[PDB]
UniProtKB/Swiss-Prot annotation, chain A:
The protein's name in its UniProt record: Ryanodine receptor 2
Tissue-by-tissue expression: Detected in heart muscle (at protein level). Heart muscle, brain (cerebellum and hippocampus) and placenta.
Compartment annotation: Sarcoplasmic reticulum membrane
Function: Cytosolic calcium-activated calcium channel that mediates the release of Ca(2+) from the sarcoplasmic reticulum into the cytosol and thereby plays a key role in triggering cardiac muscle contraction. Aberrant channel activation can lead to cardiac arrhythmia. In cardiac myocytes, calcium release is triggered by increased Ca(2+) cytosolic levels due to activation of the L-type calcium channel CACNA1C. The calcium channel activity is modulated by formation of heterotetramers with RYR3. Required for cellular calcium ion homeostasis. Required for embryonic heart development.
Name of the encoding gene: RYR2
From Swiss-Prot, chain B:
Maturation and modification: Channel activity is modulated by phosphorylation. Phosphorylation is increased in failing heart, leading to calcium leaks and increased cytoplasmic Ca(2+) levels.
Subcellular location: Sarcoplasmic reticulum membrane
Reported tissue expression: Detected in heart muscle (at protein level). Heart muscle, brain (cerebellum and hippocampus) and placenta.
Record-given protein name: Ryanodine receptor 2
Family, per entry: Belongs to the ryanodine receptor (TC 1.A.3.1) family. RYR2 subfamily.
Disease: Ventricular tachycardia, catecholaminergic polymorphic, 1, with or without atrial dysfunction and/or dilated cardiomyopathy: An arrhythmogenic disorder characterized by stress-induced, bidirectional ventricular tachycardia that may degenerate into cardiac arrest and cause sudden death. Patients present with recurrent syncope, seizures, or sudden death after physical activity or emotional stress. CPVT1 inheritance is autosomal dominant.
Entry's induction text: By TGFB1.
Domain text: The calcium release channel activity resides in the C-terminal region while the remaining part of the protein resides in the cytoplasm.
Covered residues, full protein: 3859 to 4099 of 4967
Length: 35, 241
């Protein structure tokens, strides 16, 4: 979605927004996936 | 900290903190490698010992930098990455204290680790040495504690349930469970001692049972038990308090 041309065409950020749930270490993620 | 006369200045006080952060990250990774495993091998035990010695020496150097209050060095550490290293050490301490205590083959590792903790707390106290009301160092240390709240809660419960152990073992109910003063008690009698004490819940009682090593005779040396788990508790907890 283009946000540079905001003056001419409105951007649809509603489908561009994301949320950060979890930030685990690589070791912890590998252990969890093993479990 | 600052070489005034020289054309170029190098901050040894910050380079030390940087090495401390690197060694802390190394120790954290080397613990996360062993968290799943049941028992730490001999090679792992030696490597932890050497890393703990290095970290202990770095902490001693850092506290020598700031004791005899050096305001400049204190401010430099306050604005450095020291808090990040202390946060990781707090997590390692909170988990390894609960892990190594259950295993009876890691007494030396636990003793080295619980002396590293005492040096860290001494460094933290030296940071607050010569403080003022509503100081920046105080604010940053409060922030670091808030960030590491859970680890400190676990450490403080670990200390509390061992500081109550001296009262349990000095109580007279313990003496009428073990009439002889020899200092040798059976595991069943020690369990009913915790149950009669009633300041230990079921989880604390079973954890104390797990951390208590008993021979085939179903008996243990509670004086040695309370010593190993009380004097380090007594001095580290005093420094934390």
């Amino acid at each position: 979605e283009s946000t540079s041309n905001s003056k001419n065409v409105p951007p649809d950020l509603s489908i561009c927004t994301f949320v950060l749930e979890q930030s685990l270490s690589v070791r912890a993620l590998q252990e969890m996936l093993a479990n | 900290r600052t070489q005034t006369g020289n054309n170029t200045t190098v901050n040894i006080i910050i380079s030390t903190v940087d090495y401390l952060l690197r060694v802390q990250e190394s120790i954290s990774d080397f613990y996360w490698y062993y968290s799943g495993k049941d028992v730490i091998d001999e090679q792992g035990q030696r490597n932890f010992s050497k890393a703990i010695q290095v970290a202990k020496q770095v902490f001693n150097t850092l506290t020598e930098y700031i004791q005899g209050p050096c305001t400049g060095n204190q401010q430099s550490l306050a604005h450095s990455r020291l808090w990040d290293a202390v946060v990781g050490f707090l997590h390692v301490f909170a988990h390894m204290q609960m892990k190594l205590s259950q295993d009876s083959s890691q007494i030396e590792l636990l003793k080295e680790l619980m002396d590293l903790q005492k040096d860290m707390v001494v460094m933290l106290l030296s940071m607050l040495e010569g403080n003022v009301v509503n100081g920046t160092i105080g604010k940053q240390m409060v922030d670091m504690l808030v960030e590491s709240s859970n680890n400190v809660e676990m450490i403080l419960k670990f200390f509390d349930m061992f500081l109550k152990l001296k009262d349990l073992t000095s109580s007279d109910t313990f003496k009428e469970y073990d009439p002889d003063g020899k200092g040798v008690i059976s595991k069943r009698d020690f369990h009913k001692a915790m149950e009669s004490h009633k300041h230990y819940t079921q989880s604390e009682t079973e954890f104390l049972l797990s951390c208590a090593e008993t021979d085939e005779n179903e008996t243990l040396d509670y004086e040695e038990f309370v010593k190993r788990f009380h004097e380090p508790a007594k001095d580290i907890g005093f420094n934390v308090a």
